[PDB]
């Protein structure tokens, strides 16, 4: 309750009469509120966004290193310099022409044969992966709100013994799921991916424990050495002269340099790249929304029969005003006639209690059969003046409210 009462990005729906089909949109960080006539209140949540099974496509290679640096230099008229490793597909080259002459340990002046090759290594990688539609995987949170214990619950540690909560996992191959609700009932779900963002379109990038989604022709273009596929082993890295450069070359070598990590270039150029994370084997993606229809025909209220609440309710917390103007109350109360219904409305003519406005948590119940017991609501107040009604008769407590 408290995680959906405190998220800006919170949806309220309301069923129709029929009372079997709601339609709601889920997004990461965002909750939404399901209220329907004589149901109890849902709040459903995306927790987790899925991809499995993220297939190599490319690497590329932003630190580097050489070793075995080797030059050899011909006269003129001498034929062409040659080295052992110039074949090498591990080794990167240079071939030149370079003055020579007496000073040179040449008999003649002119142009010799020089040829410098360096065994090039890779220290550290990144790499591209490839999201297929048919291993996305969506997590679902069902919670009834206002179960006289969701008023405390602000985390997911609370749900495997819980009745009153379920979780859902949704593909594209079964995109239809069932919560069950215990003594509330259950809800039928079927989850399809809303269209904007497809993620088949896109390469995982991961880079020194740092992950991004990236569009695939920026991926395709990037400048640096690079293999395909895994076919982990001796990888062939192509391009290597994008870390490798050759300077000057003088009369019987060549001086071969690496440039420094792109880690800096690569992080610049991953400026508004969606950002990811890697749990396990699985991507975690953050970014998406989800288009799912509810079936609320099997969902039922608990405790519509139960007997009002008799004794005094008391104000613990002062009323407070949320984000979408709703107000959350907190009451004591010190009976112990068991399971009873708590009265709790908005009311504008106190003389005969009018409701008015709208009461979130639907049914509002207190299981504790022992005293003081504490128990919190959500109202949807009429805009303007109006009032905070707990309890009936004489001990009914009264609280002035005004919506802008």
Not at 30 to 50: F, N, W
Not at 324 to 330: F, I, K, Q, S
Not at 374 to 395: A, H, Q
Request: hydrophobic share 35%; net charge negative; glycine share 10%.
């Amino acid at each position: 309750m408290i995680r959906c009462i405190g998220v800006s990005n919170r949806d309220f729906v309301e069923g129709m009469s029929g009372g079997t089909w709601v339609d709601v949109v889920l997004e990461h960080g965002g909750c939404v509120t399901v209220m329907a006539q004589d149901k109890p209140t849902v709040d459903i949540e995306l927790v987790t966004t899925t991809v499995s099974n993220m297939a190599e496509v490319r690497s590329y290679c932003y630190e580097a290193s050489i070793s075995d640096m080797a030059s050899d230099s011909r006269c003129p008229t001498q034929g062409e310099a040659y080295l052992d490793k110039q074949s090498d597909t591990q080794y990167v080259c240079k071939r030149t022409l370079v003055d020579r002459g007496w000073g040179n340990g040449c008999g003649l002046f002119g142009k010799g044969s020089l040829v410098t090759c360096a065994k090039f290594a890779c220290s550290k990688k990144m790499t591209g992966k490839s999201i297929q539609p048919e291993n996305l995987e969506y997590r679902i949170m069902l919670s009834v709100h206002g179960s006289q214990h969701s008023g405390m619950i602000v985390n997911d540690t609370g749900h495997e013994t819980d009745e009153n909560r379920a979780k859902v996992e949704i593909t594209p191959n079964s995109p239809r799921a069932e919560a069950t609700l215990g003594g509330f009932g259950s809800l039928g779900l079927d989850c399809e991916p809303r269209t904007g963002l497809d993620f088949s379109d896109l390469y995982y990038l991961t880079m020194n424990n740092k992950h991004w989604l990236v569009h695939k022709e920026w991926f395709h273009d990037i400048p640096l050495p690079w293999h395909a596929g895994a076919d982990t082993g001796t990888p062939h890295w192509n391009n290597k002269e994008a870390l490798v450069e050759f300077k000057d070359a003088h009369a019987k070598r060549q001086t071969v340099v690496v440039l420094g990590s792109q880690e800096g270039a690569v992080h610049t150029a991953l400026a508004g790249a969606l950002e990811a994370e890697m749990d396990g084997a699985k991507g975690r993606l953050s970014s998406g929304h989800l288009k799912c229809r509810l079936k609320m025909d099997k969902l039922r209220l608990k405790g519509v029969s139960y007997s009002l609440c008799t004794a005094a309710f008391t104000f613990t917390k002062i009323p407070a005003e949320t984000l979408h103007g709703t107000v959350t109350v907190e009451v004591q109360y010190a009976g112990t006639d068991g399971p009873c219904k708590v009265p709790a409305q908005m009311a504008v003519d106190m003389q005969t209690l009018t409701p008015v406005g709208r009461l979130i948590t639907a049914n509002p119940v207190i299981t504790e059969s022992t005293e003081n017991s504490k128990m919190m609501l959500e109202l949807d107040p009429p805009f303007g003046d109006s009032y905070i009604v707990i309890g009936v008769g004489e001990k009914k407590i009264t609280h002035h409210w005004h919506r802008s």
